[PDB]
Ligand binder design. Structure first.
Ligand code: F3S
Length: 65
């Protein structure tokens, strides 16, 4: 599992960042992006799917391999 935020879809709700601070960083304009790895650790797999479910703009993709 990896995370991606589509920059064109992001409108900076910051829900992703409130749910999974560990997985997203916000730029100075409030837009989110995947952090370091992008790879989702075993303990954050659920917060990942939640952040994606919760984004109002459907801006988050999770890849599965
Ligand atoms: S709008 Fe952007 S800030 Fe997060 S909650 Fe969605 S990716």
């Amino acid at each position: 599992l990896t995370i991606h935020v589509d920059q064109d879809k992001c409108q900076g709700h910051a829900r992703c960042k409130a749910l999974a601070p560990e997985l997203f960083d916000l730029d100075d304009y409030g837009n989110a992006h995947e952090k370091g790895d992008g790879v989702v650790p075993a303990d954050l797999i659920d917060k990942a799917w939640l952040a994606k479910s919760n984004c109002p703009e459907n801006a988050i993709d999770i890849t599965e391999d």
